Amino acid sequence: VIQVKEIKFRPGTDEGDYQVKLRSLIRFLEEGDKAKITLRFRGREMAHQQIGMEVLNRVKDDLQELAVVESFPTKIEGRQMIMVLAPKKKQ
Amino acid sequence: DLRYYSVIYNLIDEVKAAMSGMLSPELKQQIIGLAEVRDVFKSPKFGAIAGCMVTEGVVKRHNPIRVLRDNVVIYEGELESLRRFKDDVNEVRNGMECGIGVKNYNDVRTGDVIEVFEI
Amino acid sequence: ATVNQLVRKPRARKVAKSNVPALEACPQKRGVCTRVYTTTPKKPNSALRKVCRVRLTNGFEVTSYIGGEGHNLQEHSVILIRGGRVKDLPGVRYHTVRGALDCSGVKDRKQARSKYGVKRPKA
Amino acid sequence: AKEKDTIRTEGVVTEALPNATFRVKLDSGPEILAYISGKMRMHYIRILPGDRVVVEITPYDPTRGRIVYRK
RNA sequence: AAGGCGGCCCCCUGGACGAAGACUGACGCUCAGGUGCGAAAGCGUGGGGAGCAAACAGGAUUAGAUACCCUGGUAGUCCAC
RNA sequence: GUACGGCCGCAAGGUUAAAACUCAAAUGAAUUGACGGGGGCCCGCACAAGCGGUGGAGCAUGUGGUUUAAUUCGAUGCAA
RNA sequence: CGCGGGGUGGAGCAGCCUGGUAGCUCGUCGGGCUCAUAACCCGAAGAUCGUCGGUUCAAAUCCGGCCCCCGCAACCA
Secondary structure: OOEEEEEEEOOOOOHHHHOHHHHHHHHHHHOOEEEEEEEOOOOOOOOOOOHHHHHHHHHHHHHOOOEEEOOOOOOOOOOOOEEEEEEOOOO | OOOOOOOHHHHHHHHHHHHHHHOOOOOOOEEEEEEEEEEEEOOOOOOOEEEEEEEEEOEEOOOEEEEEEOOEEEEEEEOOEEOOOOOOOOEEOOOOEEEEEOOOOOOOOOOOEEEEEEO | OOHHHHHHOOOOOOOOOOOOHHHOOOOEEEEEEEEEEEEOOOOOOOOOEEEEEEEEOOOOEEEEEOOOOOOOOOOOOEEEEEEOOOOOOOOOOEEEOOOOOOOOOOOOOOOOHHHOOOOOOOO | OOOOOOOOOEEEOOOOOOOOEOOOEEOOOOEOOOEEOHHHHHOOOOOOOOOEEEEEOOOOOOOOOEEOOOO
16 A cells, blocks of 8 residues: 655755755655655744745645645644645546 | 037036936837637646637737736736747737737636737 | 075065055045945944945945944045954954045044044034 | 934844844835844843844944844 | 785895904985885776675665665776786 | 966876965963763662552642633742 | 546555455654753554445455546647
């Protein structure tokens, strides 16, 4: 079956650091796992308007090829926000 | 710039001239072409392609457009892609089948007319 | 060390590098104000210090301090600058001479007036 | 003496720059470099990247301001 | 001399030290420039290739883990010039 | 030990070798502490050896949070 | 009327042709580690396994419908 593995994208994870581990996150998805993005804000229940949805959204948008995301969640639970990412579903 | 003037009258005129030029006012432009769209098509990139028929003038690529329905303007913007068939020509004359699509325009309805105008 | 060595290569004193090259060994220089602004200083200080960028009669363009409380200076102000760094403002190596050319004196000064271009108040 | 052309306008912490530095966007118009007031730093008072804050602005340089009111 | 040199045997060869006395008769010391030597990695051509192992792949650990650990493994490590 | 120039190298690079700019320091050894999941030696219910617990349940109680007109003020890692 | 692959817990999976209490990850809430946080570690919560009829000892897995998502497909100016 499809497993849950995970990646994180903290703030201060931009292109450099970031898309290196977008490569890591391909890898997760491409094993045939459902790769769960966890944001972990320096922040709160509304940390950001920046932190999350640059990253997350560009992770989707770059990975969009292979993966898509289940939801663009933008409901933070705690000081951290799960964007859930899956294999792109065959219709 | 070094300019010397024998009389004060030739000076008082040109300083004004320098000032008049400084101004940058656009009070309205001249439509380049007016076209009506029919039989919308779907595109992955722009989200929509509205088939068009130019009734007057010539449609151009980078010139701004005014999308209006029933005399009121539903939407405004500048063309990104002007494409007829697979040709993707930058210019379309009047009474020639034409094609159009733009980003950030969600709803294409028949009967409305798009007004393109040069600046 | 060797005498022989010094005889081949004499003692050679280092040439002093200046701290106010824009002055070119002049006591003051004149210049037009290019930008007039404020800037914050270095650890541990904190303020909005008045400085200006000034293009000098000799082409050099430098930043210069505008000391005193209050000044009426703007772009195209023609001022006189003198040597004198501002320590908690790196890059700032000159001072503006209050009360010369377009630069006014400090308003209402009573002590140290001559360092701020202030006439002696009738009294 | 100390002139009085200072102001106390408010704004919101935008960026979390280095060494108690912030992008603080003035509710008024724009944002300024805003540094943390001595007082405030002495009494600690960490300052998250998204707080309503009070700024002291010298007309001399509107581009800059000091954070006075903690939150 | 420094770099560095370790199984055993032979061949070619440099230096050091000791004993005794004979010979030469200051032929000495140092050395900018010059010349030669100079670990490992690296480079070129052709060989060689057990073990090890940059790179790389896979398995794990971890919040992440382009690492540390594991299973593999190419250059390289070996020979000649 | 960078740039420019020269010489050298198939290359990687080497060699010679500056200035502007910026700071009031940078540095060496030793000293008294503190600290160590750098090291050595040594102590304490610190571990180890044991006996009984807390973490589950119901209630008492304090705090946080949430609520409120008000839930008065303070105590907040071991040391609230 | 027209193809693909799927429906299990909040989200994504495993348990499949090998039909007997549905377990494994990220989140959730706690506990532990730290001076403290991140990270990490011990843990508990969390389900008509889409929905029905068939079929059977007992069918998650067994068939077919209703139905839904994705897949490409179809609208590819």
